[PDB]
Amino acid sequence: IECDSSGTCINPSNWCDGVSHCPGGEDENRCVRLYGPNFILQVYSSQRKSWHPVCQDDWNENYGRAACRDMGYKNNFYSSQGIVDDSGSTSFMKLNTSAGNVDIYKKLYHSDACSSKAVVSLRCIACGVNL
Amino acid sequence: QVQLQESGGDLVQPGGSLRLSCAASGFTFSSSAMTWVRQAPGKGLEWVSDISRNGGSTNYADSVKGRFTISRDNSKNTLYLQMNSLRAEDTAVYYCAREGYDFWSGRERRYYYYGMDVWGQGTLVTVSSASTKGPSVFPLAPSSKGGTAALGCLVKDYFPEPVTVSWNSGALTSGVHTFPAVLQSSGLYSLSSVVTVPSSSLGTQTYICNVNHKPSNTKVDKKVEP
Amino acid sequence: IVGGESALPGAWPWQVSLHVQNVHVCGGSIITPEWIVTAAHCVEKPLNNPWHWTAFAGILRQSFMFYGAGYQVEKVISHPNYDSKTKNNDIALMKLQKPLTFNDLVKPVCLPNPGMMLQPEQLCWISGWGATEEKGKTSEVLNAAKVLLIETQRCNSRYVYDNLITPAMICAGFLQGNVDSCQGDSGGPLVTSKNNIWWLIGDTSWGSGCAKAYRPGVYGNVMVFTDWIYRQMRADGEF
Amino acid sequence: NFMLTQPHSMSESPGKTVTISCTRSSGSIASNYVQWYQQRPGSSPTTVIYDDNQRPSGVPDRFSGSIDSSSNSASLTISGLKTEDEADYYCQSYDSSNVIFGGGTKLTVLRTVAAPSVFIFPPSDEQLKSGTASVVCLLNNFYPREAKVQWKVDNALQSGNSQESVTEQDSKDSTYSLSSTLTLSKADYEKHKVYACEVTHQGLSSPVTKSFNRGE
Ligand SMILES: *[C@@H]1O[C@H](CO)[C@@H](O[C@@H]2O[C@H](CO)[C@@H](O[C@@H]3O[C@H](CO[C@H]4O[C@H](CO)[C@@H](O)[C@H](O)[C@@H]4O)[C@@H](O)[C@H](O[C@H]4O[C@H](CO)[C@@H](O)[C@H](O)[C@@H]4O)[C@@H]3O)[C@H](O)[C@H]2NC(C)=O)[C@H](O)[C@H]1NC(C)=O
Ligand SMILES: [Ca+2]
């Protein structure tokens, strides 16, 4: 509810709803994240007011690259594949392949299961290796 | 916009003659006294001669008296140094300079000029019996075996001085080290020019050394690669 | 770094040396070809201006960081809630004018994800050109040492930091001292290995002396700052 | 007539103030105006002071001149020393017929010790075709100037067959660079395998050797 750059507060239904309500944009620029050491792609749902894994259903590199841009990685993209959920989640976000030209988190809707029975693991940049 | 540009420096035999010239621009040439100052390689500045505004008065260092003659052509904005009976110890860079610091003396009815406010580019005079020889340019190629690599050009066996080296026709200047030439026991000079570049640039960026030895009309652009 | 050893080439390829007036001032960590994480206390005025700063990557020795070869910094961003007096939210971002070229010596470290499930005393590494003993000079060579996370509740004990450690802070090192970060390491990485990936957990922030008993190193809690980092990165992408 | 004597060298750290003296051998220093010329390596001189204490247009007020009657000397003072001030400085005066220069003072800017970056270069195949082999060892951006290059050929120490050249102080980081060339005929070059440059310097905890094996 509270925006960061200002002391502004907004309604939770207005968090990650495709429309800018915070003066600093905080409500609409951290809607995509990578969860845990296995990089489970998650998206904030304004309806359930919680984070949820993204179904592998219909997913591909175009969508993974778009999630990476939204996260701030610009043109970077490393690897992506479907994995079985280890985050302990009960509900998921499913891709609407006819959603149009909106941000990634707005092309997903709630679904109690994924048809491909897998969630998206996504790495935006080749990091974390030495030697 | 006051500029002085010398010319005429060359290789010349002991006992020979040469005439240097200096073109002045950006000021009224006849309004200032002018001077020649020379510098032997690795040595200090040595005044050679000076001349009054209209050429009436001239003065000479004892080391060139009876051999050199200074003169000027105010209609051509040009200063001259005529040198006869040249000898090896006249080998030096000869600077043209405007002796612009002066004062009028009422009692002697004349200007007295005593200091230099503008300097030229210099022209090198080499007095020697040796023959002109153009250099060979060899690559100093980076070792294929981090971060910083080094490459360069070896400019070997030339005479007389000088050679100039640029990298990428003047675009590359950072990291460049052009070393003083060494005189080899053969009587020929040899110098190296090197530049340090990022190792990640080796495969992508082109590195060309532009070697110039005007005494032999030698112009070489050598591309260096591992 | 106190009580560590000299680093080998490619061992910590995200480590950078940040220079002002041709001398090392602070460390930092590469996260993208353009973005470096460092400490807000390194870029306090007048050092908040980007034109002061250059970054050196993939080089172990300060003598080999030639003037004019470092990457010029284009943008400097301190955390908006940074408090210089208490060092709370001691994190800053540095954006380069030219992108780095990754190789065996220059690579980014991974930003931490939520749900890392790190152990309470997780085994970590620190690295930098900081002094090798309190009040010493900048190290010529890059050093590194292994430290353990120290639970914040234990770090806030009356015998340690006495309630100074905020949720924006994490403690790492040893209560017996001997191994620690030090003056010059500020802004550099605190990293851990999990799932065969190196993660940036902290940026060197502050401490009472170096390697003193009951005075471990304090680091900015990078996990708490990832939202802000992503926002600065995304806002810049909208160039 | 008279001479002008300057110290051969003078050194100071950046930001500090440095003074270069110029002593007249006979007659009073105040009898004739003193000029000061700056000359960077490989460049023409430029005037920084004239008429004892006047500055040409465009010269910063960090440069000042004065004259001292008791010591019969003129002095160039540079405050707020900068790396771009590394150069040779010449004082100049005159009698009734001569222009007289001091011998010049090289101004060195002090800095921290810097270890050399060392690189070795085998002779090019193009040069070997001519019958001579030049092996080049490069010491890059070190300080202070003192450095020792030792050539080894199959671990045999070389003597008499190399020549060195050293750059003047770098105008931006105040370091030096050195190039050493080992010269051998192609016939002698192909009689050995390991060619090594061993460098000793104040910034190196132990000698650094760069080497190559001929043909590898
Ligand atoms: C995947 O993504 C696609 C792309 O957005 C979604 O398709 C849209 O779905 C919405 C919501 O269901 C549709 O909106 C509804 O459209 C009805 C049809 O008229 C619309 O389209 C015509 C096109 O000529 C327009 O002229 C007209 O203005 C409308 O936009 C409307 O009748 C609906 O309005 C009525 O019902 C709503 C409640 O649902 C009331 O609030 C209104 O007052 C009104 O009574 C409504 O606007 C939209 O048309 C769809 N667009 C397209 C291109 O198909 C998919 O739904 C989505 N799929 C999943 C599974 O998420
Ligand atoms: Ca919103």
Short mmCIF file of N, CA and C and ligand atoms in Angstrom, two decimals, chain A residues 96 98-99 109, ligand 1:
data_model
loop_
_atom_site.label_atom_id
_atom_site.label_comp_id
_atom_site.label_asym_id
_atom_site.label_seq_id
_atom_site.Cartn_x
_atom_site.Cartn_y
_atom_site.Cartn_z
N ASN A 96 -1.81 -15.75 -21.06
CA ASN A 96 -2.85 -15.47 -22.05
C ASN A 96 -2.13 -15.08 -23.34
N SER A 98 -3.17 -14.28 -26.09
CA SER A 98 -3.85 -13.24 -26.86
C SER A 98 -3.99 -11.94 -26.06
N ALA A 99 -3.09 -11.71 -25.10
CA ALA A 99 -3.24 -10.59 -24.18
C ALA A 99 -2.93 -9.24 -24.80
N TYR A 109 -3.07 -14.80 -15.89
CA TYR A 109 -4.27 -14.89 -15.06
C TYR A 109 -4.13 -16.07 -14.10
C1 LIG E 1 -6.96 -12.74 -22.91
O1 LIG E 1 -6.77 -11.42 -23.37
C2 LIG E 1 -7.82 -10.99 -24.27
C3 LIG E 1 -7.41 -9.65 -24.81
O2 LIG E 1 -7.74 -8.60 -23.91
C4 LIG E 1 -9.14 -10.96 -23.51
O3 LIG E 1 -10.18 -10.60 -24.42
C5 LIG E 1 -10.96 -9.51 -23.91
O4 LIG E 1 -11.74 -9.87 -22.78
C6 LIG E 1 -12.48 -8.75 -22.25
C7 LIG E 1 -13.09 -9.19 -20.94
O5 LIG E 1 -13.75 -10.44 -21.08
C8 LIG E 1 -13.51 -8.31 -23.28
O6 LIG E 1 -14.23 -7.20 -22.76
C9 LIG E 1 -15.64 -7.38 -22.95
O7 LIG E 1 -15.96 -7.29 -24.34
C10 LIG E 1 -17.36 -7.41 -24.64
C11 LIG E 1 -17.48 -7.31 -26.15
O8 LIG E 1 -17.42 -5.96 -26.59
C12 LIG E 1 -16.05 -5.52 -26.57
O9 LIG E 1 -15.37 -5.68 -27.80
C13 LIG E 1 -15.95 -4.92 -28.87
C14 LIG E 1 -15.15 -5.23 -30.10
O10 LIG E 1 -15.78 -4.73 -31.26
C15 LIG E 1 -15.92 -3.43 -28.51
O11 LIG E 1 -16.60 -2.70 -29.51
C16 LIG E 1 -16.57 -3.18 -27.16
O12 LIG E 1 -16.34 -1.83 -26.76
C17 LIG E 1 -16.00 -4.09 -26.11
O13 LIG E 1 -14.66 -3.73 -25.80
C18 LIG E 1 -18.13 -6.31 -23.93
O14 LIG E 1 -19.52 -6.51 -24.16
C19 LIG E 1 -17.84 -6.34 -22.44
O15 LIG E 1 -18.44 -5.21 -21.81
C20 LIG E 1 -19.61 -5.61 -21.08
O16 LIG E 1 -19.32 -6.52 -20.02
C21 LIG E 1 -18.46 -5.99 -19.00
C22 LIG E 1 -18.24 -7.10 -18.00
O17 LIG E 1 -17.53 -8.19 -18.57
C23 LIG E 1 -19.10 -4.76 -18.38
O18 LIG E 1 -18.22 -4.20 -17.41
C24 LIG E 1 -19.39 -3.73 -19.46
O19 LIG E 1 -20.04 -2.59 -18.90
C25 LIG E 1 -20.25 -4.35 -20.54
O20 LIG E 1 -21.56 -4.63 -20.06
C26 LIG E 1 -16.35 -6.29 -22.20
O21 LIG E 1 -15.84 -5.02 -22.59
C27 LIG E 1 -12.79 -7.90 -24.56
O22 LIG E 1 -13.71 -7.61 -25.60
C28 LIG E 1 -11.85 -9.00 -25.04
N1 LIG E 1 -11.06 -8.51 -26.15
C29 LIG E 1 -10.79 -9.23 -27.24
C30 LIG E 1 -9.89 -8.59 -28.24
O23 LIG E 1 -11.25 -10.36 -27.39
C31 LIG E 1 -9.44 -12.34 -22.94
O24 LIG E 1 -10.59 -12.30 -22.10
C32 LIG E 1 -8.27 -12.88 -22.14
N2 LIG E 1 -8.50 -14.27 -21.78
C33 LIG E 1 -8.29 -14.75 -20.56
C34 LIG E 1 -8.60 -16.20 -20.37
O25 LIG E 1 -7.87 -14.04 -19.65
#
